[PDB]
Amino acid sequence: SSSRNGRDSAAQRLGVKRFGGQVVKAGEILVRQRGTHFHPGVNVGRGGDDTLFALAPGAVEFGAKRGRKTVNIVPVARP
Amino acid sequence: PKAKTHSGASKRFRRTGTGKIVRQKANRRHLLEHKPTKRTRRLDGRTTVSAADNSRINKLLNG
Amino acid sequence: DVRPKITLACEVCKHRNYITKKNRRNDPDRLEIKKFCPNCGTHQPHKES
RNA sequence: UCUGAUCGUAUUGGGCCUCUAACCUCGGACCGUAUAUCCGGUUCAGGGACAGUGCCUGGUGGGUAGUUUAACUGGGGCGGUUGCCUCCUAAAAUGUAACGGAGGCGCCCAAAGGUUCCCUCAACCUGGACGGCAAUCAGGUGUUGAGUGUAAGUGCACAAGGGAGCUUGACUGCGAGACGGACAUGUCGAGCAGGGACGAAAGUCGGGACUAGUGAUCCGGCACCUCUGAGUGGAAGGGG
RNA sequence: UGCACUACGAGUAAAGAUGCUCGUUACGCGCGGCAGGACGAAAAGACCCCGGGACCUUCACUACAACUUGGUAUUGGUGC
RNA sequence: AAAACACAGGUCCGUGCGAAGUCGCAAGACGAUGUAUACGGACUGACGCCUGCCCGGUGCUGGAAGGUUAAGAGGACCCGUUAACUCCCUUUGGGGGUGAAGCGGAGAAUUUAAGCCCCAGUAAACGGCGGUGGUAACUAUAACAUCCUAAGGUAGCGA
RNA sequence: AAGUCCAAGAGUGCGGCAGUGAGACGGCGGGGGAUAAGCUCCGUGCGUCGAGAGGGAAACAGCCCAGAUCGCCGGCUAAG
RNA sequence: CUGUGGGUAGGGGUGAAAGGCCAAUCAAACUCCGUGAUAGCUGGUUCUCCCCGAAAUGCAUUUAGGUGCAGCGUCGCAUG
RNA sequence: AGCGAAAGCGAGUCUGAAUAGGGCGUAUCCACACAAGAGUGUGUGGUGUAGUGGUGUGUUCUGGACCCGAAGCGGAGUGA
RNA sequence: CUGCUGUGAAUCUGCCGGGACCACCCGGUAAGCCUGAAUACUUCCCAGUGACCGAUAGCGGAUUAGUACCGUGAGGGAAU
RNA sequence: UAUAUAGGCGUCUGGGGGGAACGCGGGGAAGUGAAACAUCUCAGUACCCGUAGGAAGAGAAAACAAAAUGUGAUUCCGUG
Numbered sequence A: 001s002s003s004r005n006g007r008d009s010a011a012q013r014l015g016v017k018r019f020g021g022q023v024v025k026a027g028e029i030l031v032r033q034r035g036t037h038f039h040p041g042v043n044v045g046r047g048g049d050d051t052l053f054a055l056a057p058g059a060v061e062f063g064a065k066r067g068r069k070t071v072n073i074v075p076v077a078r079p
Numbered sequence B: 001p002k003a004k005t006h007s008g009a010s011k012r013f014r015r016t017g018t019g020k021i022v023r024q025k026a027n028r029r030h031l032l033e034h035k036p037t038k039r040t041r042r043l044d045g046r047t048t049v050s051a052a053d054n055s056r057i058n059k060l061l062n063g
Numbered sequence C: 001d002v003r004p005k006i007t008l009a010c011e012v013c014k015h016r017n018y019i020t021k022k023n024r025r026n027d028p029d030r031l032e033i034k035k036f037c038p039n040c041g042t043h044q045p046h047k048e049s
Numbered sequence D: 001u002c003u004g005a006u007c008g009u010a011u012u013g014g015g016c017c018u019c020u021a022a023c024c025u026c027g028g029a030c031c032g033u034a035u036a037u038c039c040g041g042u043u044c045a046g047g048g049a050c051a052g053u054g055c056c057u058g059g060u061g062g063g064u065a066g067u068u069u070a071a072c073u074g075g076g077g078c079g080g081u082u083g084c085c086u087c088c089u090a091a092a093a094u095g096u097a098a099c100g101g102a103g104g105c106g107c108c109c110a111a112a113g114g115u116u117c118c119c120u121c122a123a124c125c126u127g128g129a130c131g132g133c134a135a136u137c138a139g140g141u142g143u144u145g146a147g148u149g150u151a152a153g154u155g156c157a158c159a160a161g162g163g164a165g166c167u168u169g170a171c172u173g174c175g176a177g178a179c180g181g182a183c184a185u186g187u188c189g190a191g192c193a194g195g196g197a198c199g200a201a202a203g204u205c206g207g208g209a210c211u212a213g214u215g216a217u218c219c220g221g222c223a224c225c226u227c228u229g230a231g232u233g234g235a236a237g238g239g240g
Numbered sequence E: 001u002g003c004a005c006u007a008c009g010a011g012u013a014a015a016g017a018u019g020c021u022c023g024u025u026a027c028g029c030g031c032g033g034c035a036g037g038a039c040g041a042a043a044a045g046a047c048c049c050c051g052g053g054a055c056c057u058u059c060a061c062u063a064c065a066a067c068u069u070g071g072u073a074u075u076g077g078u079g080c
Numbered sequence F: 001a002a003a004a005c006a007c008a009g010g011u012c013c014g015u016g017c018g019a020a021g022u023c024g025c026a027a028g029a030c031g032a033u034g035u036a037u038a039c040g041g042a043c044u045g046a047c048g049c050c051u052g053c054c055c056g057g058u059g060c061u062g063g064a065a066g067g068u069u070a071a072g073a074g075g076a077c078c079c080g081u082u083a084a085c086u087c088c089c090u091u092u093g094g095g096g097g098u099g100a101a102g103c104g105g106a107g108a109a110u111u112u113a114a115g116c117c118c119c120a121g122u123a124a125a126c127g128g129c130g131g132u133g134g135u136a137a138c139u140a141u142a143a144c145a146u147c148c149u150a151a152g153g154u155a156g157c158g159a
Numbered sequence G: 001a002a003g004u005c006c007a008a009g010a011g012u013g014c015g016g017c018a019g020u021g022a023g024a025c026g027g028c029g030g031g032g033g034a035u036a037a038g039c040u041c042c043g044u045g046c047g048u049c050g051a052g053a054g055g056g057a058a059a060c061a062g063c064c065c066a067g068a069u070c071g072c073c074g075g076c077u078a079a080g
Numbered sequence H: 001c002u003g004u005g006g007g008u009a010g011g012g013g014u015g016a017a018a019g020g021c022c023a024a025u026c027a028a029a030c031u032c033c034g035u036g037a038u039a040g041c042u043g044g045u046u047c048u049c050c051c052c053g054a055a056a057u058g059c060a061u062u063u064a065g066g067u068g069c070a071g072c073g074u075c076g077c078a079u080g
Numbered sequence I: 001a002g003c004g005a006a007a008g009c010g011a012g013u014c015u016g017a018a019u020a021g022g023g024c025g026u027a028u029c030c031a032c033a034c035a036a037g038a039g040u041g042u043g044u045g046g047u048g049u050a051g052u053g054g055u056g057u058g059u060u061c062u063g064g065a066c067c068c069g070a071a072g073c074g075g076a077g078u079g080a
Numbered sequence J: 001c002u003g004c005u006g007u008g009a010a011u012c013u014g015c016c017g018g019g020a021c022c023a024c025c026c027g028g029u030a031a032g033c034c035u036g037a038a039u040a041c042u043u044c045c046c047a048g049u050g051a052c053c054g055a056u057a058g059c060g061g062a063u064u065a066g067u068a069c070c071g072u073g074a075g076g077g078a079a080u
Numbered sequence K: 001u002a003u004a005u006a007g008g009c010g011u012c013u014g015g016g017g018g019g020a021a022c023g024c025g026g027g028g029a030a031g032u033g034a035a036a037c038a039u040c041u042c043a044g045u046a047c048c049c050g051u052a053g054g055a056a057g058a059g060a061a062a063a064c065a066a067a068a069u070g071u072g073a074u075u076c077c078g079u080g
């Protein structure tokens, strides 16, 4: 007459936060995730909870490097 | 009769030189051992009250 | 408790700088480690209070 | 002049048997008082420093008084549930409800933290005394099916998995820029300086492969500080 | 007692219609009767839920009366 | 309007006397111009035969060797203030340490009542009254060995 | 990159004044239920009703057409 | 049984006990006063036109028919 | 005239060991330089900074506070 | 500052206060008593005034008005 | 019952009751608010009791103050 379940946790709002070709500031976090689904690419660092962030200003762009999806920051030219 | 300032809110909120109302962050009075110092120091100093709460806090402060 | 809260104090100035936990079943003796003392200015041994 | 077995004086308590004089008697008589089971007085007879009563104090105390006794909910009740974490529902961004479908949490580890270096499992075949498919040895095949403290998911063989050395960064002063957000919470973070660890150096280190292991404010405790101190100096008290 | 020159049937509609649809029936006005309907009148449902009361019970809470303990004042004397 | 209340009868408990109980802040009053063959309270309910067990729980009553405990007496020890010094270290001061008395603050040992724990009695006090393992007359009709308790339904009655 | 641009009467920021926090059915994707309900619970730069008049569906909030500034004894059409 | 006179008063009285009765009222009489008690509840709130125009969701809630903040309307200013 | 818990200092001030970052503050705009394109800063000049008191309107606070409505609670009295 | 209870001093090199307390300084002189003015109100009397009402208004009462009437009573209480 | 007192007799002089508000000294709620409620509030309010006066009460420092060669009884009003 009772359900032995009915509990869940809060949604953590994970996922890609900046997509390809998007200009970011240095320090912006770019994708929140659990494991390493996206590996840190060139000029992109990885946080303690596996959060990828940008170590330099530029444009986001994804890639594959030896069978590993990677995220990179590309230096846009100064006008 | 002259209006009364809400005393519980005056000992919690303060105004700066320009007139924005500042605050004190919570979760820093006890049970501190398990909190990393990064969490501890992102929780101190003042911070401006939200625009959503600025309307009621103003009425509590002016009475 | 078996993992109680403990405090560490510098020997050369007796100031309590850090609070941590440890297992009393596994570390019955006072825990001592070389920590950093803000007023001594350098790393000093710190012993359980 | 301490150690002691001692008597006495001055003083003050604890107790005991008493005495009467406070106080008490609805015991008698007499009087105010012609009238009076009131009342007061006088006196005899009894208690008696007790009792009663003030003040302070501990018990017992529905005798009375004021009140409280949650919500969700396919009506209500009875059951079950209430915070956090993971997955599916959830319709390939995020978010998404039901008493929808499954499980975990309220810890643990002074190493199971930091760094430096080194290694690759599980399973299967073959050869070996106990020893059997199975325990340890040797040869081979074996790219991940093993393992990762702990649920599940995302990861990890480049290893985040296995082993050893040293060691405490399970730091102090901070923090550009952001994610998430009714708000309050929360989450990531390069980089600078102090003082260190490891490393030849490059460099990495603000606990743990990651996401649970938690409780706002009030009020109070404690240690430290260069703050304050109700005329002044202290203190008490407050403050950081 | 909102009205008014207030039929029926099968429907439709806040799901049980005199008043809407489509058809059927019906000259106008009364008197005596009957109670099928007007979810008829009456009484801001008393059942049930929600909020609030009130009185009752008790090892609910917190108090107080009452009862009781001791100290001390009233309260003193001699002997041990 | 009843089967309910009352009742005459029964018991239990309290009360030694301006009793106990009740109405009152008190004085005072009823009880009662009564005095345990009386009065109050509780249950039962003429009569007849009877009224089992359990005192562990909770009350009531009684007791005291201990444990625990208020106010009150006690003020060891500590802290504040400062007469005095005593020193530097710079000089007409000013901080270090000690610090008597006096006044203040926190106050331990020690001592002390009832209650509670404790131990007894009490059920016409509020209350409670069991099973299992395998069995025969023609099936029976629960009254062989053992577990548990404070004790395991007595008499009578019983769709 | 354009479009719309004498308008969407559009975004965003600050402020004054709000109401709302009982939604309904229909189309598509689903949970609960018996792949029942005019059932219940979610998603939808989906619609309409709510807060919508007019025409169609006999009548018939939520379906189809179409959004009522007023007048006309003009014309053309939409669903049907 | 009854007449006349009298006594008991509201958390009180009285009850051969039904919560009975105490002035047509009683699980605490009535009158006045506190007082215009308080009600997250129901009801009502009065002339006109012009422009714009919702929500019935999220989060928290001694919370679930109430409220706060967000979302969504309007007006003023800024930007464009 | 602000910063600071405060002593205090003052176009600064707090934190800090830091001419080392950040917080708050120095109306606002203009230019010229000197530094980096990690979001612009720093500095020299310039411009120079707007409040207050009546009163209308909207909302609000304290008051019965838009109007109406309990069952009930208290004080003092009236009734056998 | 002050009530009830207990204990209980000094007469000026005294005693009190200056937000626990102590020291120093300063102010004052308790346990005795009187005291005008400036301040509060209007039963009643006089004289006035009103961007006050004008007979369902204004006092309950423009008229038999605390009247008639209702109640055992406190009390309620018109209409003209 | 001796001292005597309690009492008794006589002769005077006062007291008593009423009143709308204002004063002073005492006793002292609850509705309510706190979105429950008990501290708290309401509120020392309502009510009650004792007493006045034309006003009352207070009043002549055992006060403030803060190092100023400062104020100087009380009451009331405005600020703070």
Ligand SMILES: [Mg+2]
Binding pocket: A009, A010, A011, A012
């Ligand atoms: Mg999840």
Ligand SMILES: [Mg+2]
Binding pocket: A048
């Ligand atoms: Mg890490």
Ligand SMILES: [Mg+2]
Binding pocket: B007, B010
């Ligand atoms: Mg204040």
Ligand SMILES: [Mg+2]
Binding pocket: B029
């Ligand atoms: Mg703290």
Ligand SMILES: [Mg+2]
Binding pocket: B032, B033, B035, B036, B037, B040
């Ligand atoms: Mg810390």
Ligand SMILES: [Mg+2]
Binding pocket: C026, C027
């Ligand atoms: Mg060890």
Ligand SMILES: [Mg+2]
Binding pocket: none
């Ligand atoms: Mg005595």
Ligand SMILES: [Mg+2]
Binding pocket: none
């Ligand atoms: Mg006594």
Ligand SMILES: [Mg+2]
Binding pocket: D062
């Ligand atoms: Mg009680």
Ligand SMILES: [Mg+2]
Binding pocket: none
């Ligand atoms: Mg009660």
Ligand SMILES: [Mg+2]
Binding pocket: none
């Ligand atoms: Mg109440």
Ligand SMILES: [Mg+2]
Binding pocket: none
């Ligand atoms: Mg409720």
Ligand SMILES: [Mg+2]
Binding pocket: none
């Ligand atoms: Mg409910």
Ligand SMILES: [Mg+2]
Binding pocket: D073
């Ligand atoms: Mg149900």
Ligand SMILES: [Mg+2]
Binding pocket: D074
């Ligand atoms: Mg149902």
Ligand SMILES: [Mg+2]
Binding pocket: none
């Ligand atoms: Mg998704």
